[PDB]
Design a protein around this ligand. Structure first.
Ligand SMILES: *[C@@H]1O[C@H](CO[C@@H]2O[C@@H](C)[C@@H](O)[C@@H](O)[C@@H]2O)[C@@H](O[C@@H]2O[C@H](CO)[C@@H](O[C@@H]3O[C@H](CO[C@H]4O[C@H](CO)[C@@H](O)[C@H](O)[C@@H]4O)[C@@H](O)[C@H](O[C@H]4O[C@H](CO)[C@@H](O)[C@H](O)[C@@H]4O)[C@@H]3O)[C@H](O)[C@H]2NC(C)=O)[C@H](O)[C@H]1NC(C)=O
Ligand SMILES: *[C@@H]1O[C@H](CO[C@@H]2O[C@@H](C)[C@@H](O)[C@@H](O)[C@@H]2O)[C@@H](O[C@@H]2O[C@H](CO)[C@@H](O[C@@H]3O[C@H](CO[C@H]4O[C@H](CO)[C@@H](O)[C@H](O)[C@@H]4O)[C@@H](O)[C@H](O[C@H]4O[C@H](CO)[C@@H](O)[C@H](O)[C@@H]4O)[C@@H]3O)[C@H](O)[C@H]2NC(C)=O)[C@H](O)[C@H]1NC(C)=O
Ligand code: HEM
Ligand code: HEM
Ligand SMILES: *[C@@H]1O[C@H](CO)[C@@H](O[C@@H]2O[C@H](CO)[C@@H](O)[C@H](O)[C@H]2NC(C)=O)[C@H](O)[C@H]1NC(C)=O
Ligand SMILES: *[C@@H]1O[C@H](CO)[C@@H](O)[C@H](O)[C@H]1NC(C)=O
Ligand SMILES: *[C@@H]1O[C@H](CO)[C@@H](O)[C@H](O)[C@H]1NC(C)=O
Ligand SMILES: *[C@@H]1O[C@H](CO)[C@@H](O)[C@H](O)[C@H]1NC(C)=O
Ligand SMILES: [Br-]
Ligand SMILES: [Br-]
Ligand SMILES: [Br-]
Ligand SMILES: [Br-]
Ligand SMILES: [Br-]
Ligand SMILES: [Br-]
Ligand SMILES: [Br-]
Ligand SMILES: [Br-]
Ligand SMILES: [Br-]
Ligand SMILES: [Br-]
Ligand SMILES: [Br-]
Ligand SMILES: [Br-]
Ligand SMILES: [Br-]
Ligand SMILES: [Br-]
Ligand SMILES: [Br-]
Ligand SMILES: [Br-]
Ligand SMILES: [Br-]
Ligand SMILES: [Br-]
Ligand SMILES: [Br-]
Ligand SMILES: [Br-]
Ligand SMILES: [Br-]
Ligand SMILES: [Br-]
Ligand SMILES: [Br-]
Ligand SMILES: [Br-]
Ligand SMILES: [Br-]
Ligand SMILES: [Br-]
Ligand SMILES: [Br-]
Ligand SMILES: [Br-]
Ligand SMILES: [Br-]
Ligand SMILES: [Br-]
Ligand SMILES: [Br-]
Ligand SMILES: [Br-]
Ligand SMILES: [Br-]
Ligand SMILES: [Br-]
Ligand SMILES: [Br-]
Ligand SMILES: [Br-]
Ligand SMILES: [Br-]
Ligand SMILES: [Br-]
Ligand SMILES: [Br-]
Ligand SMILES: [Br-]
Ligand SMILES: [Br-]
Ligand SMILES: [Br-]
Ligand SMILES: [Br-]
Ligand SMILES: [Br-]
Ligand SMILES: [Br-]
Ligand SMILES: [Br-]
Ligand SMILES: [Br-]
Ligand SMILES: [Br-]
Ligand SMILES: [Br-]
Ligand SMILES: [Br-]
Ligand SMILES: [Br-]
Ligand SMILES: [Br-]
Ligand SMILES: [Br-]
Ligand SMILES: [Br-]
Ligand SMILES: [Br-]
Ligand SMILES: [Br-]
Ligand SMILES: [Ca+2]
Ligand SMILES: [Ca+2]
Lengths: 105, 465, 69, 105, 465, 70
């Protein structure tokens, strides 16, 4: 890292001079807790038919959506005390913070 | 196996299967497409799989400027020394700039209005076209950069293009920091949590790890509960605009044509200021425009954003609700009764236990957004802990934080404290009437609105050299 | 690189961009100052395009109309 | 992991049922702090001639040993209150806890 | 590049360079050999390089039983159903068992006494021959296993081999836990730190991460400061044994022949009980038997174990002294003055600043072992923090901890609390006179010694079935 | 696995072990019980040695004297 600088790098390298990948792009997330995978190290829960998590079946994510998350849209409750700009700033901000890549086809 | 068209479970595809009596997808041999996030160390049977952030974790306005040096250059106007970001060369919005067009071989924006032949936009982040409301925010900040660079060149004529760009970028970055930490986050967390997780800034701390934690990529999706089923557009009287004032969201995803041909960013921004967000309620979590019709115009089947959220958390190996509660120092319910107490809602507890069998297995997003909201906040205690802790790290671990000694002069800090999103809107659009502070709470026209004249512009005099 | 989300390619840096065509116009403008063009040649040479024939040819391969060149 | 077991596995797998590689053999160490490498991610300090750490030259480890660690052996101080078995149990115990592999010749 | 016979810095070699005025190595184009630890994710330019633990982190006596299923089987006596560990087939120690021989094509034990033709031993850990005092400890535990299995077969005749092995193993594992946590660690950390880092055991906590931290591999090398320059051997009067009573350490590395031919493990154990350890002092850190002549009999050049310590911490990308101080909640000196205060020794501080330039750069081992010792402990506050924290995790995060409900019966726990290292020695050797509790503090014959008869044996009656 | 430390090979599982020779004697002991031998055959077959000729021959390659089976 240069000893002295005046502006941020684009990548975020050198923000932290002691560990200069910290907060830079194209690096692993940090883990605040140990990961929890079906096989210990890479397979997600739900992968293998009939394999439980902590003694219970894994719920289909779409089932959870259907049963818990679905509601009739005409019953929507406006937030008296928040604008839609509050939604939109959140998404714009998220897009300053994290993008998790996936393989293309 | 192409994960987009195939329902076979083979790496890297983890398609969401369809339940027996699904309200929308009758055919149980079908599936919702899903590609597992890229692993840090592909093919390892030593490492515990982890995922990658392609962006700078810092609040540095990397959505505007990019997070990689080829994109970052490609976004710049390289035909002169004015330090400007590149703008569209075919289209303008009543005389103001639009984002340049990106060039994708398979462009999803073109699939929305086929006949309009308007491609996706190019910005510091690649998701800028996902909804036109997002596009408008990106476009706003594009313009603010170029306005600043223009004002700075006028003030310091002997500054070259590199210098103008950096200084403008440095200002835009602080504006994002200030709006985020002063105006947005207090309304996310509520005052109790804000004082707990984001106490008064002291100074840069080089031992604070500023990385995004894996769980934050899922937790901060709490915002999905805020989404309304329509895009609202308003004329200069803040009345509905008659080329479709209330477009269903499933017809605006990647609909870049709407910005270019249906009246630019002004109506969209009016819509955002003068329409309420949706309230998260335990029985009204997220709407069917994202739960049933996500991206249905550009893709073989509509996705389910809530469900994707949950599949993704398992893809990323995230522990369940009780593990994150414990991490945060919060009681961990074991029974349906105790979960009812925590949620102040026994009915919802019962529904969660019927799905998951134990609160230990509740997926972090689902448990997070199920929690009753903190007073004057829009998340429960668990999400407030995760999101609070994240933004503390991003602030105290950022050597270029705007209040860090050496980053700006005292005079420049004094002048930066005058900025607000309303003013930025006045400066860069045809809108002359905008929300009162706080823009994120103000939501009703005209009760909550003021004329642009009443707002102080950013004074750049202490940038003279 | 190719940035990808839900099976949708959202950006690819490999590709020529439409706004870079306006840079081709500055290079062919005979009354544009020589420092401006040198800076652009350097921009396009950092991307591995060294002549205007190599620049125009890359725009064409990436789907642009270059018939006014 | 089996739902019920009576003894430890040899490898240590399944000791922690939620994240069953934790404590098991042939896994990465956990990090209590972010690593500090010359280049941010893999090259040790001292690797590249002329590259400092936090603004100071990297000291040859052998130099540090010579100047700080070396002492005349006739001056060795016996510990009145510790046996040599105290040394040896530490080495035996260490060999229950960690072995960091290296490439062979 | 063969890192043993070349001084070229090319992966995976990171040879230690030689300073100008070196007391031993005249030629600066020579080097001390060093192989970088195996990376977890080889070849990655995304991951932050990290290293691998080949062993179970748990205090499970994996040095006896192995940490991998091929070795683990190979260590067992497979010719009967008695649940025994395999023993040497060529040699015995006045009738008692010795470790089996390992078979290496380039065996370093053979290179010590060339003519004796005695190879290295095989045990659960691969380093069992490194010094014969270590070998004796491995041998002792081998015998304890087989004695237990024998007693259990007598007590429960219908038990098969698998059952005997597991039960004995489970006992030997608890014995290592008890000796370590009751007898050893309090004398490492001192009482204040023991109460701080290892408060009284409550119960298994499945959220405590039991992994070895990278830094602990370096910090726990504090033990290098305890090493005496000789191996001491004593006859049954606890007098020096006359086939070389005091062998220099540089002639005992890999010297397995000394165990087999120079009188077995009895003299070596007597030596360990009745000889004082070396004291760590700031001007007497570590001896030249390991600083100048490490492994010199089996290798082209003698290594420098302290220097290896420091090269290894950089190989592992470990932060420097002040970062670990801060991690532990200890003041971080910036100036030579402040470091003098922390070390109670301005002279040493000056020497550290001359090497490193800032206390931020001091390698963790060197800073660690430089610190004044806690009252009644043999580490300073930094090392006590790291080592304390590590053993807390190994205890509270171990589902099979010996005191965890359901691992042993109350009767079995009561009986296990009577065990001690002196007793194990009485049970498995020809020694009839052994140290008083605490074996690790007792060090002077005969003041500190008792007869084996006075010590209560382990009663296995509550294992009857 | 080959386990390596400071350029010294400390163990290699590929190699036959001296104590496994005593197992060869149990297999050739005509008066040793058939359950014991089956267990040993399985032990050596888990390692990929299926006959006693293949076992004795592996011990030889790994430096042991096997002339006392002639
Ligand atoms: C079972 O063991 C769990 C692990 O406990 C640790 O290990 C054992 C061996 C002991 O040493 C123990 O004392 C250790 O803590 C244990 O759970 C742990 O619980 C603590 C306390 O609740 C949690 O700490 C809290 O963390 C949150 C989140 O921030 C943390 O993480 C980030 C990044 O990793 C860091 O930046 C932070 O510094 C934190 O470490 C904090 O919000 C919280 O502090 C705030 O709230 C408290 C409470 O109101 C205030 O007093 C503070 O001032 C703060 O405002 C704590 O620091 C810890 O995350 C959690 N870990 C795990 C793995 O879950 C569990 O409780 C044990 N159970 C029993 C019954 O013993
Ligand atoms: C600069 O920031 C540093 C990091 O700050 C964290 O993030 C910022 C944003 C804040 O939220 C801050 O509160 C966070 O801590 C900061 O350094 C930190 O300082 C704390 C307190 O001194 C350190 O915590 C201590 O940790 C040790 C070691 O154990 C920790 O790690 C292990 C393994 O990961 C865990 O298992 C443990 O649960 C701990 O998290 C503990 O031994 C110690 O606790 C013991 O002593 C205290 C006090 O006597 C008791 O209350 C406890 O019960 C224990 O008996 C602390 O928990 C922390 O490790 C350290 N972090 C780093 C990265 O160095 C620094 O102080 C800031 N500097 C300034 C000037 O602001
Ligand atoms: C109009 C608004 C929004 C969307 C449309 C949208 C969509 C997505 C999608 C498709 C994903 C990927 C899901 C997957 O796992 O396959 C996604 C992820 C993330 N979101 Fe969404 N989102 C919209 C809006 C918001 C708002 C308001 C958010 C927060 C306040 C928000 C957050 C996030 C985050 C952080 C992610 C993860 C990002 C990553 O790649 O790391 N979104 N969203
Ligand atoms: C006879 C006594 C001791 C040795 C001989 C000896 C030697 C080593 C060597 C060669 C290493 C590796 C050095 C390198 O980094 O290349 C080593 C590492 C470790 N030690 Fe040493 N040691 C003897 C004695 C002790 C005692 C008393 C210790 C603790 C009380 C102790 C600890 C350790 C540890 C934990 C390591 C790291 C091991 C790993 O691979 O993870 N040693 N020792
Ligand atoms: C698809 O895009 C076209 C523009 O290419 C839209 O057509 C325009 O509609 C407006 C408002 O109705 C008219 O005033 C314009 O004159 C139309 N232009 C053309 C060229 O037809 C069309 O409405 C869009 N379709 C959808 C689905 O809304
Ligand atoms: C660069 O700026 C000039 C002057 O404002 C403008 O005319 C031109 O269109 C811009 N180029 C691009 C590609 O943005
Ligand atoms: C196995 O045990 C028997 C009886 O205790 C003994 O005679 C034999 O030599 C042992 N073999 C090995 C390899 O330990
Ligand atoms: C080497 O071993 C032999 C026994 O084989 C012993 O008599 C001799 O004294 C030893 N030599 C050394 C160097 O100690
Ligand atoms: Br840069
Ligand atoms: Br995480
Ligand atoms: Br992990
Ligand atoms: Br982890
Ligand atoms: Br419904
Ligand atoms: Br297919
Ligand atoms: Br995959
Ligand atoms: Br289902
Ligand atoms: Br269907
Ligand atoms: Br890992
Ligand atoms: Br503009
Ligand atoms: Br349309
Ligand atoms: Br998106
Ligand atoms: Br500049
Ligand atoms: Br602020
Ligand atoms: Br507030
Ligand atoms: Br709170
Ligand atoms: Br931190
Ligand atoms: Br308008
Ligand atoms: Br439409
Ligand atoms: Br809807
Ligand atoms: Br498709
Ligand atoms: Br849990
Ligand atoms: Br509870
Ligand atoms: Br109910
Ligand atoms: Br409800
Ligand atoms: Br409010
Ligand atoms: Br409110
Ligand atoms: Br809270
Ligand atoms: Br207006
Ligand atoms: Br206002
Ligand atoms: Br505002
Ligand atoms: Br105005
Ligand atoms: Br495992
Ligand atoms: Br570490
Ligand atoms: Br790291
Ligand atoms: Br880390
Ligand atoms: Br240097
Ligand atoms: Br390497
Ligand atoms: Br990493
Ligand atoms: Br014996
Ligand atoms: Br010798
Ligand atoms: Br060793
Ligand atoms: Br104990
Ligand atoms: Br104590
Ligand atoms: Br923990
Ligand atoms: Br001194
Ligand atoms: Br010496
Ligand atoms: Br530091
Ligand atoms: Br003491
Ligand atoms: Br003492
Ligand atoms: Br102290
Ligand atoms: Br008890
Ligand atoms: Br004796
Ligand atoms: Br004792
Ligand atoms: Br043998
Ligand atoms: Ca960023
Ligand atoms: Ca172990």
């Amino acid at each position: 890292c240069p000893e002295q600088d005046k502006y941020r790098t684009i990548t975020g390298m050198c923000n932290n001079r002691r560990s200069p990948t910290l907060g830079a792009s194209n690096r692993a997330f940090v883990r605040w807790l140990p990961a929890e995978y079906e096989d210990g190290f890479s397979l997600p829960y739900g992968w293998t038919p009939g394999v439980k998590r902590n003694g219970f079946p894994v719920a289909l994510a779409r089932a959870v959506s259907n049963e818990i998350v679905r509601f009739p849209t005409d019953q929507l409750t406006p937030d008296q005390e928040r604008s839609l700009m509050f939604m939109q700033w959140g998404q714009l901000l998220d897009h300053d913070l994290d993008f998790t890549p996936e393989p293309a086809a | 196996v192409n994960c987009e068209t195939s329902c076979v479970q083979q790496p890297p595809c983890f398609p969401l299967k369809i339940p027996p009596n699904d309200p929308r997808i009758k055919n149980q041999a079908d599936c919702i497409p899903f590609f597992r996030s890229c692993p840090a160390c592909p093919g390892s049977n030593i490492t515990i799989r982890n995922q990658i952030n392609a962006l700078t974790s810092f609040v540095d306005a990397s959505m505007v400027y990019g997070s990689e040096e080829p994109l970052a250059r490609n976004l710049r106007n390289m035909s002169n020394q004015l330090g400007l970001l590149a703008v569209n060369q075919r289209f303008q919005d009543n005389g103001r700039a639009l984002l340049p067009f990106d060039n994708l071989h398979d462009d999803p924006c073109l699939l929305t209005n086929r006949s309009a032949r308007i491609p996706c936009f190019l910005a510091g982040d690649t998701r800028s076209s996902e909804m036109p409301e997002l596009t408008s925010m990106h476009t706003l900040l594009l313009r603010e950069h170029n306005r600043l660079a223009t004002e700075l060149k006028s003030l310091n004529p002997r500054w070259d293009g590199e210098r103008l760009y950096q200084e403008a970028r440095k200002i835009v970055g602080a504006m994002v920091q200030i709006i985020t930490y002063r105006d947005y986050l207090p309304l996310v967390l509520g005052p109790t949590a804000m004082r707990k997780y984001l106490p008064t800034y002291r100074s840069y701390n080089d031992s604070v790890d500023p990385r995004i934690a894996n769980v934050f990529t899922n937790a901060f999706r709490y915002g999905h509960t805020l989404i309304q089923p329509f895009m609202f557009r308003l004329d200069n009287r803040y009345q509905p605009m008659e080329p479709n004032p209330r477009v269903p969201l499933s017809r605006v995803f990647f609909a870049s044509w709407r910005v270019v041909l249906e009246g630019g960013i002004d109506p969209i921004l009016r819509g955002l200021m003068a329409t309420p967000a949706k309230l998260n309620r335990q029985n009204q979590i997220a709407v069917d425009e994202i739960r049933e019709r996500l991206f249905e115009q550009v893709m073989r089947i509509g996705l389910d954003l809530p469900a994707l959220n949950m599949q993704r958390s398992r893809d990323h190996g995230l522990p369940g609700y009780n593990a994150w509660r414990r991490f945060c120092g919060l009681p961990q319910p074991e029974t349906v009764g105790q979960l009812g107490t925590v949620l102040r809602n026994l009915k919802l507890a019962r529904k969660l236990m019927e799905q998951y069998g134990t609160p230990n297995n509740i997926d972090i997003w689902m448990g997070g957004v199920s929690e009753p909201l903190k007073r004057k906040g829009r998340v429960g205690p668990l999400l407030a802990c995760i999101i609070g802790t994240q933004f503390r790290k991003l602030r105290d671990g950022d050597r270029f934080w705007w209040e860090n000694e050496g980053v700006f002069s005292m005079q420049q800090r004094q002048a930066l404290a005058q900025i607000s999103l309303p003013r930025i809107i006045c400066d860069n659009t045809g809108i002359t009437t905008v929300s009162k502070n706080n823009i994120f709470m103000s939501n009703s026209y005209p009760r909550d609105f003021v004329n642009c004249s009443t707002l102080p512009a950013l004074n750049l005099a202490s940038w003279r050299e | 690189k190719v940035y990808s989300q839900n099976g949708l390619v959202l950006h690819d840096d490999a590709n020529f961009l439409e706004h870079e065509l306006s840079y081709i116009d500055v290079l062919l403008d005979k009354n544009a100052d020589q420092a401006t063009k040198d800076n652009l040649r350097s921009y396009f040479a950092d991307k591995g395009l060294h002549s205007i024939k190599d620049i125009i040819n890359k725009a064409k391969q990436d789907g642009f109309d270059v018939s006014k060149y």
